[PDB]
Write a protein that binds this ligand. Structure first.
Ligand SMILES: Cc1cc2nc3c(=O)[nH]c(=O)nc-3n(C[C@H](O)[C@H](O)[C@H](O)COP(=O)(O)OP(=O)(O)OC[C@H]3O[C@@H](n4cnc5c(N)ncnc54)[C@H](O)[C@@H]3O)c2cc1C
Ligand SMILES: Cc1cc2nc3c(=O)[nH]c(=O)nc-3n(C[C@H](O)[C@H](O)[C@H](O)COP(=O)(O)OP(=O)(O)OC[C@H]3O[C@@H](n4cnc5c(N)ncnc54)[C@H](O)[C@@H]3O)c2cc1C
Ligand code: NFU
Ligand code: NFU
Ligand code: SF4
Ligand code: SF4
Ligand code: SF4
Ligand code: SF4
Ligand code: SF4
Ligand code: SF4
Ligand code: SF4
Ligand code: SF4
Ligand SMILES: [Cl-]
Ligand SMILES: [Cl-]
Ligand SMILES: [Mg+2]
Ligand SMILES: [Mg+2]
Ligand SMILES: [Mg+2]
Ligand SMILES: [Mg+2]
Ligand SMILES: [Mg+2]
Ligand SMILES: [Mg+2]
Ligand SMILES: [Mg+2]
Ligand SMILES: [Mg+2]
Lengths: 231, 385, 280, 231, 280, 385
């Protein structure tokens, strides 16, 4: 019995699904023998939503699109776990900047992370999340590795993010130690370091949350880190 | 007549609806395809903002093809700012797109594999696609910063050049990939032909629009020929016209086809038309794209500048970025003045193709309709932006 | 209090060029240089020269010359982790080395275990050399020590060092010192809750404490760390002595490591009483 | 019996106290007959903190300054009501950008709004709050006008603010109607309007929260508005 | 359902220049012009010409000519509140007028009652003229109506109007219409929860509904509103009729106001069921 | 000897500590004054950021005197960028500062009123101060956007010119204010003299540093004479030296006095020294400041440009902004390159005065010490920034 997974694309860009598929070596075995992708028209010819063990929900949801809202509601009913797949679903990401007014739907204006409308069980922030974190998450769910997954469960509550979080949650709190991990991680290169402190280029920030996610001073998963190092 | 509705159409990027009116025998007499993807509204998002913001945001139109949006954006802005990009930066931009074509066409083979690849060959096909994408994406990661939403395509060129280590590593991997891509293309073309789709399926009389064989050329996009209208003056069913989420760009007052077949027709003397031709052109273009990337890596001077200095205030000049995305001509237009984006418009390949796709299902059984759609490799987040 | 390890020795590079340039035993420069020459790594991120004296900048070294140019300690910020992804993108590196103080080692190990936003970097790190750390200073604090208290300037400093209860500056003909307790309150506040003295999560960890001048105390930890360092020794690039046979020896190292942890736990508890967020 | 008021300056700029004093016509009567300023060395020669009915606390607090922390703790003990006086105290305001490293105290790095360390009863966001809101607040407290003061009590919980709040709390939520009130209010002129939607110049944002405070769609005090209009 | 008011009349400007330019009775232009000439105000914020046809920009008018240049309705955004503070700073105005749709009136009244960040503006507003509103449109929606559905262009439109179940466009020689229900879904979503039709919080409120073509239904509300409008009438700048004597009259106004409120309450309830933040 | 500590000193802006060593008779033998205000760290905050950010942030150094910080910041940045500000913008900047002096000196009279104003005159004095500030602040609000943290002093000049309505309104109010300011100054000077402070109180031999009589002049701030050291090499008590929060700027290797008396000595032939002289100079300068603002309003062309165009990338040039703040010379230094602030330093008037203030208490009873301090009108948020 393979885990039944749905991949539901709302107002996303499909980059998250693409990242999943850049687990090149294992992809054929993953799709054919490890999990069962049972729903999501990007991948499956099925127009009646089935029960799922896990829904990977990509994209924010548009408050002015009735079908998106119904689809989100239905997948919450039919999936045991809902994962906000990528920062648009998890934090709104760059759709936080949408403000409507464009053809051919000038009223399409308002986009929110999915937890603003439904209960979310875990999250994978990232724009997109790395092929590695996606593979490790799926394997963990396969093997019931709940110790590994705890940060994903916790991150379900991180739904409004910005590079300024490094100030408000780290530097302001007396926690920053100038390591540069945040600047290493930022997928848009919005971050530099000035005199050992993060420097935000707001013109490049997509509000994805990854800098604060990777900061060693936001949360420190010591036991899992040592386990993997054999220490 | 009876209405067959497929919503959303499957194994493509993003959500569209196909509506086919069919006669007693199930033959399509009237076909309409339209976006039902919500409008995230990238054009109106980047209007009013700093120029550096636009490439970052518009590449997130689509995570299947972010490379050509980043390129069209910086080319439009370069053009608005009268920037001359240094030779090595132009080559790295071209190399990034050439590698990207290989990746993207391989992604389409993945999506259409259920239609064309026998069950006993399916594992092999996924593994073939994956090895090809792995090698293509080494280029996009090393040169452009990230393999999805590359960070280092920039106004004025690229963020940085690459090392000799990088250049020679990429060269060897792409050249050694040639026989694999040749074998894959041969295999895919044979399978597409083996499906036995009816003769003439998807053949239409619309223009083929293409600016260049493999990168792009703003001098071939003629604003005296381009117009843009809205679904309300295109679709003749008012409920559909109100639901449709993408605009309707036209050339010489007519709807067109863009993409690999269009480029092959306009630049490589390709004479085949319709669904099978579209797949065949796309597969053959993998040869073109990989060969070009290999040659650029051979030519590249890793010690040379890749980025021009520039004054970002602007003069109110309309800048055009015309890029041949894997799915077709991707035009971004940008006007910079007072250091802000005063105007922005994107005419993305699937945006062009959508008005052509519905009617191209007509004349054959509606069960062929979805195959007509996938031949365009449609991308609805792209179409809608 | 020293974390998990395989072996602890006292060691010194046998390369006279490295000996001349090194802070201590030249373990970092010697080991990265060996790994580079052997093809175990293709480059390494190090704290290289910057735009002000003793104000380093992280940089990707791809030759022994560049590694050597980064040798010697700067007691101020060099956010080395920031360059790890550039190193595997445009620099083309698929086998990466780096040197890191303990908090930087933590950001790196956290990334490898949980690479949420970090694509195709984690498995490319092949050698993580940790260096011991008790505190780090903003650049202006170094200036207070050197330009104000000791009455010279940053440009007159040929080497800086910390040990035996003092901050040390070497000039072209003079050795100047301050009591180390005099630097209290000038270090970044974030160090207050740091529990890791000997870079417990590194592949190999090294520092001066426990060893005599010009030698280093070297703690091998992971299979990669132990095997690469043992290889270099066998190749005659390091001289080693059992740490039990060396003065001051392991007792001093364990004392300082325990002091650091006790201080951190007190400060972590103080944060929690105030209601401040704390990851420890 | 006049209300006993303390004015305590932490890491502020004293602009809030200056604003209070730009109630020009009433100032002499205010200080002499309406209230009793009993503590705050900016104004009063007293070095033993007394009991207060209201503490107006200006400025964020520096986590690395022991006296600031003790002074904050003591005023919470001795004041019946604590008001975060101005956005530095209320939201951190521009000190959210502080990151240490400057002479003559390179370790002075971390600044937080006072509610991060103590219970705050009401707040006056603004940089500085207008002379009018300060006067109206004091008069309201004098007259026990709790209906008028309710938004000030509520705003005690708004401690992390930014111009992006207009997106995350209004535009994203389907509430923005393009009135321009936010751009009118912004004291740094960080806001413009683009196609009827707020446009943030992040280079000028001081994270004071005033745009969202004044937005008619953040909270709508209808009864008090009509009362004052005689409607 | 009409809010608090003192009197309701049907009225029309007696100024032929204003009659030619006005959307309806010319109440806004006529009243602001009267207040300006009398020194009741020194300027007013209005929706003036912008950089695209029928895409207005808020501006501070300090002459009758500038007021007249702003006359006529544009059914898209003009965030008039944004210019109120500029008007009392560099323009030097201490007696300010403005015209506002109901949601703009709300931002203004909220500012006056709670001026947290707004220094020395609240008491300078001397005349707030409200205009009736049922919905507003992004500019692209107007283009869909005018350029796509009706097959002309923004430049060919000499006047636009809404009433009697239709959206109207006047060209140099043609009157084109759409059923108003055809514009549903093209208005900004924020209008869905709006309860205020007749600008209930304005000093004086005015609109076309309830009055015949070229006339306006004028609701005076505050002491300032009633007294300033009565002054202008007495000065012969407006002709007025009791609203009970006019067709369609107050019944239609009350119907539409009640329709708007019922719709809003349904939509407000829908928001709350979804768990979305709602200030109403 | 015994230590008298006052912490914080009262009725000034911000927090400082005064430590007086006194003999058996209570006479100060050794006085030290230092900042205990935490370092918000404005210089290091704006370093690394866009030039437009610096004036917005550094004006928030202080809400008593934000006007001269905004001016020094934009002047330093203008100088770094080689900008020539148009005449009307220069006049509006000067007018804003002149009005600001009137406001600020009036604020100091408010703060020192308990020391000098008889109880029966106290209501009158507060009302006098308030009417003066009301009229001064009309100028700062209308011209510069906000009376505290003015938004519209900008790189390149001002955001906008004012109307004739504004100009003539301000002119009439300031000119009609002249007799009131003259009466107020006469009254304050009489009361300061009436207090009967001991002859010689606060007289020192330190230089008077001033760049201009009322606005500022970067050509009079000589970098060959300026140095900056830290408290650790200034104060001779190591506990105090470690606690002190402000730097120690020097001229010709020595500590100085800045402020109204300094300007009056250097530019107006003023010959009096010490505490009473400092108050008297400050009151008299209100006449100077108001007269200058009136003349600028008379001269101003409201139809003329107020802001230059500029390329904000920079060339790495060190720019100097030297402004005469109400409390003294306020120098900001800024280097713009690659469109960012590469270097920023502020040497603020109370920063200069602090090393002079402690020693100026020596030789008189410690009960006079606090009066010596207030004569400098110290601003500790300013001093520390
Ligand atoms: C902030 C700091 C605090 C330390 N405190 C102590 C400690 O508590 N106890 C102890 O025994 N040792 C201390 N060390 C370690 C020590 O000073 C040496 O760096 C270590 O012994 C390595 O010496 P080596 O001769 O083996 O290396 P070398 O061959 O001299 O090479 C030194 C390496 O360290 C890197 N480096 C130098 N400065 C920095 C920096 N600021 N950040 C990151 N990398 C840097 C260089 O790039 C170089 O690659 C400290 C080091 C730092 C940087
Ligand atoms: C978005 C909108 C929706 C409306 N819907 C209806 C309604 O539901 N029912 C009804 O009876 N009336 C409607 N009106 C009001 C109407 O169209 C008139 O503007 C009103 O009757 C005033 O006409 P007048 O002849 O008295 O004013 P005029 O003398 O013509 O002057 C009109 C004034 O309105 C201002 N103005 C024009 N467009 C805008 C805008 N977009 N935003 C802000 N100010 C503007 C102009 O600056 C000018 O000062 C609407 C107006 C708008 C702007
Ligand atoms: N190729 C491609 Fe995209 Ni997802 C499309 N259509 C475009 O630019
Ligand atoms: N005047 C003044 Fe400030 Ni609050 C001081 N000192 C300075 O620039
Ligand atoms: S998180 Fe990034 S990759 Fe994923 S849907 Fe959003 S823009 Fe696309
Ligand atoms: S990762 Fe965290 S601790 Fe490290 S520099 Fe960034 S914010 Fe500071
Ligand atoms: S700074 Fe970078 S990682 Fe952080 S939220 Fe912004 S884009 Fe994401
Ligand atoms: S003491 Fe810890 S937190 Fe501080 S610099 Fe050293 S390793 Fe980093
Ligand atoms: S809120 Fe503004 S005026 Fe008040 S202390 Fe902060 S910077 Fe100063
Ligand atoms: S004040 Fe609020 S509703 Fe009005 S434009 Fe600003 S964010 Fe939108
Ligand atoms: S946009 Fe303006 S009002 Fe809003 S938080 Fe920023 S500075 Fe404050
Ligand atoms: S219906 Fe209400 S919210 Fe919408 S524009 Fe009109 S007054 Fe504003
Ligand atoms: Cl760029
Ligand atoms: Cl500016
Ligand atoms: Mg439409
Ligand atoms: Mg060649
Ligand atoms: Mg488009
Ligand atoms: Mg040396
Ligand atoms: Mg110090
Ligand atoms: Mg007309
Ligand atoms: Mg003159
Ligand atoms: Mg300074």
């Amino acid at each position: 019995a393979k885990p039944r997974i749905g991949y539901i694309h709302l107002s996303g860009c499909t980059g998250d699904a693409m990242s999943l598929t850049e687990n090149y070596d294992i992809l054929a075995e993953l799709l054919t023998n490890m999990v069962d992708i049972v729903y999501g028209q990007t991948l499956v010819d099925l127009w009646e939503m089935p029960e799922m063990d896990l829904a990977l929900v990509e994209g924010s949801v548009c408050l002015q699109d009735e079908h998106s809202l119904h689809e989100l509601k239905e997948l919450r009913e039919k999936a045991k776990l809902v994962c906000a797949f990528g920062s648009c679903a998890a934090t709104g990401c760059f759709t936080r900047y949408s403000r409507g007014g464009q053809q051919a739907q000038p009223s399409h204006e308002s986009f929110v992370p999915i937890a603003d409308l439904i209960d979310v069980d875990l999250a994978l922030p990232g724009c997109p999340p790395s092929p590695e974190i996606i593979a490790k998450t799926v394997v963990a769910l396969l093997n019931n590795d709940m110790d590994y997954l705890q940060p994903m469960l916790d991150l379900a509550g991180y739904t409004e993010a910005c590079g300024c979080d490094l100030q408000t949650k780290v530097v302001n709190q007396g926690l920053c130690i100038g390591c540069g991990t945040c600047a290493m991680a930022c997928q848009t290169r919005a971050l530099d370091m000035t005199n050992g402190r993060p420097e935000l280029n707001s013109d490049r920030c997509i509000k994805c949350g990854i800098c604060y996610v990777q900061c060693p001073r936001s949360w420190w998963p010591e036991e899992q880190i040592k386990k993997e190092l054999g220490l | 007549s009876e209405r067959i509705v497929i919503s959303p159409t499957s194994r493509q990027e993003g959500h569209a609806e196909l509506v086919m009116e069919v006669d007693d025998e199930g033959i399509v007499t009237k076909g309409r395809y339209f976006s039902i993807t919500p409008v995230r509204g990238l054009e109106k998002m980047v209007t009013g903002k700093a120029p550096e913001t636009a490439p970052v945001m518009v590449q997130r139109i689509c995570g299947v093809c972010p490379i050509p949006h980043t390129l069209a954006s910086v080319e439009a802005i370069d053009d608005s700012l009268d920037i001359e990009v240094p030779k090595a930066g132009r080559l790295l931009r071209e190399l990034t797109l050439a590698a990207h074509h290989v990746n993207s066409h391989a992604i389409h083979h993945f999506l259409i594999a259920p239609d064309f690849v026998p069950e006993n060959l399916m594992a092999d096909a996924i593994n073939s696609v994956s090895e090809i994408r792995k090698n293509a994406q080494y280029v996009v990661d090393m040169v452009a910063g990230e393999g999805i939403h590359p960070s280092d395509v920039r106004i004025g060129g690229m963020a940085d050049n690459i090392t000799e280590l990088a250049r020679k590593r990429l060269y060897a991997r792409l050249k050694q990939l040639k026989p694999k891509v040749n074998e894959h293309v041969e295999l895919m073309i044979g399978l597409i032909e083996d499906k036995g789709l009816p003769e003439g399926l998807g053949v239409h009389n619309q223009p083929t629009l293409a600016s260049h064989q493999i990168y792009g050329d703003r001098t071939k996009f003629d604003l005296d020929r381009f117009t843009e209208i809205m679904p309300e003056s295109w679709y003749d069913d008012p409920e559909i016209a109100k639901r449709a989420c993408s605009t309707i760009p036209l050339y010489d007052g007519r709807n067109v086809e863009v993409g690999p077949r269009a480029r092959m027709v306009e630049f490589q003397g390709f004479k085949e038309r319709g669904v099978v031709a579209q797949h065949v052109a796309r597969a053959l273009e993998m040869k073109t794209a990989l060969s070009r990337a290999i040659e650029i890596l051979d030519e590249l001077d890793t010690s040379a500048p890749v980025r021009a200095d520039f004054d970002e205030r602007g003069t109110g000049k309309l800048g055009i970025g015309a890029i041949e995305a894997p799915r077709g001509l991707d035009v971004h237009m940008a006007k910079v003045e007072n250091g802000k984006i005063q105007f922005y418009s994107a005419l993305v390949p699937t945006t062009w193709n959508i008005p052509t796709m519905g009617p191209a299902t007509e004349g054959f059984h509606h069960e062929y309709g979805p195959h007509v759609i996938r031949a365009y490799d449609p991308c609805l987040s792209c179409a809608t932006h | 209090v020293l974390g998990t390890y395989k072996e602890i020795v006292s060691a010194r590079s046998t390369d006279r060029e490295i000996q001349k340039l090194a802070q201590d035993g030249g373990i970092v420069t010697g080991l990265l240089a060996y790994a580079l020459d052997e093809g175990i790594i293709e480059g390494a991120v190090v704290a290289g020269p910057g735009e002000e004296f003793w104000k380093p900048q992280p940089m990707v070294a791809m030759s022994s010359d560049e590694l050597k140019a980064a040798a010697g300690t700067k007691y101020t910020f060099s956010p080395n982790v920031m360059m790890l992804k550039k190193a595997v993108r445009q620099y083309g590196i698929e086998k990466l080395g780096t040197v890191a103080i303990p908090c930087q080692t933590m950001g790196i190990r956290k990334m490898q275990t949980y690479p949420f936003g970090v694509r195709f970097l984690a498995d490319k790190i092949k050698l993580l050399v940790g260096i011991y750390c008790m505190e780090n200073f903003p650049y202006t604090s170094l200036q207070t020590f050197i330009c104000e208290k000791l009455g010279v300037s940053m440009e007159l400093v040929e080497k800086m060092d910390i040990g035996k209860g003092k901050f040390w500056v070497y000039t072209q003909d003079d050795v100047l010192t301050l009591p180390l307790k005099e630097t209290h309150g000038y270090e970044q506040a974030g160090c207050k809750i740091c529990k890791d003295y000997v870079a417990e999560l590194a592949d190999v960890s090294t520092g001066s404490v426990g060893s005599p001048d010009g030698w280093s105390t070297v703690i091998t930890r992971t299979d990669a760390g132990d095997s690469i360092f043992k290889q270099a020794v066998e190749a005659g690039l390091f001289e080693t002595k059992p740490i039990e046979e060396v003065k001051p020896g392991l007792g001093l190292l364990e004392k300082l490591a325990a002091q650091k942890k006790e201080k951190a736990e007190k400060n972590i508890a103080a944060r929690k009483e105030m209601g401040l967020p704390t990851p420890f």
